[model samples]
Target: SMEQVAMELRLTELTRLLRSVLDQLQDKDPARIFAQPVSLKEVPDYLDHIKHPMDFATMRKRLEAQGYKNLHEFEEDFDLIIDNCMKYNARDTVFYRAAVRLRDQGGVVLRQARREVDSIG
Candidate 1:
C-alpha cells in the first residue's frame, strides 16, 4: 500500500540517521559538538536496550546502587560505556553471555537518548 512506502522511507531515514549518529558518537562526544546533552537518564522504565539500572521502574534507587545522584552522571557514564564497546571492544569480554526474554515496550522513551547523540552528531 501507499502507506507502506511511507513507512519504509521513515524506517530507512531513521535507521540510517541513527547509525550515522552512533558512529559519530563512537568517534567523539557528539554532544560536545553542540555543547548539549539532552535528558534521557531521568526517564523511568525505559526500553530494554537501556541495560544499566536494568530495573527502570525505580530509576533513582537503581542508579543509587551505583552511587549516582542523577541521570546526568549516569548518562555520561553510559556514553563512556559505548566508547568502551567501540574503542576497547569490551562486550563479551567484560561480561558472561546469556539471553533472556521479556516484553520491553519501546516507544517514546527508547529514542530519547538517541536523539541527544543525534543532535550533537
Candidate 2:
C-alpha cells in the first residue's frame, strides 16, 4: 500500500512537471499551444511525444523508480493510459479511465507484495 501511494505521488509529480514544461513551451512557441480540438485521435500520440526539455536520464530514473523494468515497458504502460484517453468520447470518461487504470495497476502490485509477505509469515 505504501509503495502504491508513493507511486501515485511520483506520478503526480511527473504530471506537474509535464504541465509546467507545456506551459513554458506554449509561451515560447506560439504554434505549440494546446487548443480545444474537435477530435481526440492524435491527442495521445502528440502528448506521448512531448519531451521534458531536459536530459533523458531524469525520465529514466523516474521510470525505474516507478517499477518499470525497462524503458520499453514504461513506454508501453504510458501509451496504454494515453490510448484509453484517446478512445473515450467524453473528457471526464477519459480522465476516469486513465485514473482507474493506474489505480488497478498499483493495486496489482500491492496485492502481489502482500502475498509475498503472507508467504514469508
Candidate 3:
C-alpha cells in the first residue's frame, strides 16, 4: 500500500509537470500547426523527409494513457515535436521560427520543473 501511494504520487507530479510543458507549447503555437498530425496529401513528400512525426494531440493521448514513465520521457516527445518541425521546414519559413520559439519556451518550462522537483528534497 505504501509503495502504491508513492507510485501514484510520482505519477501525479509527473502529470502536472508534463501538462505544464504542454500548455507552454500550446500557448507558443497559436497557429496550431503542431497541435495535430500533418496530412500527407496537404504537404507533399511530408512523410518522405520526416521519418518520425510527433504532435500535441498525440502527446496528450500518450500522457492520458500513462505511456511516459518519467519527466525525461515526456521531454523527449516534446523535443521530437519541435525537432520534426525544424527538420521539415526551411530556416526562413514560419514553421521553423515557430518551432524555435516552442523549443525555447519548452526549455523554460522544463527547467522550472526541475527546480520544483529539486525543492521537494
Candidate 4:
C-alpha cells in the first residue's frame, strides 16, 4: 500500500543519512575508517535488486510536507523489516538488518569523530 511505500522511503532515508555520516568520519580518519557500507552491499548493486524509492531529497521533502518531524515520526509501519532476520540475517530479509547495523556503526564513527574534533579544538 501507499503507507508501506512511504515507510520504506523513510527507512532508506535513514540508511543513506547514516552512511553519509560514517563517510564523513572516514574523511576525517581514513586510517581507522573508510567510505563504504559496513553492513550494506555496494549501492549500485544493492539498489539493483530492490524497488528503491524515489530520490532521497524528493522523498524527504514529501515527508516534511506530510508533517513527519523527526525520528519519532519517521517510521510508520517499517518497524519490523528486520525483526525476522535469521542470525546474521537471512538473504532475502537482510535489507533492514544491514540498514540498522550500518546505523549502529555509523553512530560509533560519528562519536569517535566528535571526540577527535573536540580534542583538537
Candidate 5:
C-alpha cells in the first residue's frame, strides 16, 4: 500500500515537472502547440502504456502530439529533455539505493517516506 501511494505521489511530482517543461517550451516558442497540458493527470496513463523503454521515435511522436511538429526545430530545447532525464535518473538511483538499504534494515517507519522521496521523476 505504501509502495502504491508512494508511486502515486512520485507520479504527481513527475507530472508537475513535465508540465513545467512543456510550459517552458511554449514560452520559448510562442508558435509551439501541445495537444494537452503536460500535467500529472496526463502522464501516468501514457507512461503505463509504454511497454518498451523510451527512444527517439517515441519521444518524437509524443512531442508531435503535443504540437511539436519538427524535432530539429528545437534542438536546444530537445537537449533539455535529455538533460532532465539524466538528472532525474541519477536522483532516482540514489534515492532507490537508500530506500532499499532502509527497508533491509527493518526500518519500516522510514521505508514509506524513503520510497515516496525516491519516486520523483
Candidate 6:
C-alpha cells in the first residue's frame, strides 16, 4: 500500500542518519574499547553486574537489520553502551574515563541527528 511505501522511505532516511551517529562513535573510540563485545573471559564478572551489554558492532548489526523503530530506540542503545562501561568499571579505570568522554561526544552527535530529522522530516 501507499502507507507501506512511505514508511519504507522514512526508514531509509532514518537509517542514514543513525549510521552517521554510529560511525562517529566508532571513530571517536581510539582504544576500541566499545568497538566489540566485551569478552567474558577477560571480565568474567561483567555479566553479573551488567544485565544488558551493548557495543558498537552490535549496534551496527541491529541498525543493518532495521531493528530500531525510531531515534529513541537507537539512543537507548547508545546510552546503554556507555552506561554499562561506567557501571562495570571503577571510576579510576581507563574504561570509565573512555565511556565518560564517549557519553559527552555521543550526546552531541545524537542531538545533531535529532535536529536533522526534525528539520527535514
Q: Best by TM-score, which number?
A: 6
Model 4 TM-score (2 dp) = 0.28
lDDT of 1 by residue, 5-45 (tens): 97666555544544443343333322232122223575343
TM for candidate 5 is: 0.30
Candidate 4 weakest lDDT stretch, 10 residues: 77-86
| lDDT of candidate 4 over 29-112, digit per residue (tens) | 323212222234434444343332322233345444554433333332122222222223355644444545644554566565
Q: Which of candidates 1 and 2 is the stronger one according to lDDT?
A: 2
Please report, in order, the local distance difference test score of every candidate based on alpha carbons: 0.36, 0.42, 0.83, 0.41, 0.40, 0.89
Pairs that collide, model 3:
none
Candidate 2 clashing pairs, residues 3+ apart or interchain = none
- Candidate 6 Cα outliers beyond 4 Å, as residue runs: none
Stretches of candidate 2 exceeding 4 Å from the true structure: 31-34, 38-121
lDDT of 2 by residue, 70-120 (tens): 224434543443344444435566444544454445444434444543463
Question: What is the clash count for each candidate, in the order shown?
Answer: 0, 0, 0, 0, 1, 0
Go through the candidates in order and give the C-alpha RMSD of each one to the true structure.
16.9, 15.1, 1.8, 12.9, 17.4, 1.1
Better by lDDT, candidate 5 or 1: 5
Could you say which candidate leads in lDDT? 6
- Stronger candidate by TM-score (2 vs 4): 2
Would you give me the overall lDDT of model 3?
0.83
Supply candidate 1's per-residue lDDT for 46: 30
Across 1-121, the per-residue lDDT of candidate 3 in tens digits comes to: 9999999888877777777767876888888879998887798788888888889999999988777887778878888888898888899999899999888877777898767766762
Better of 3 and 6 by lDDT: 6
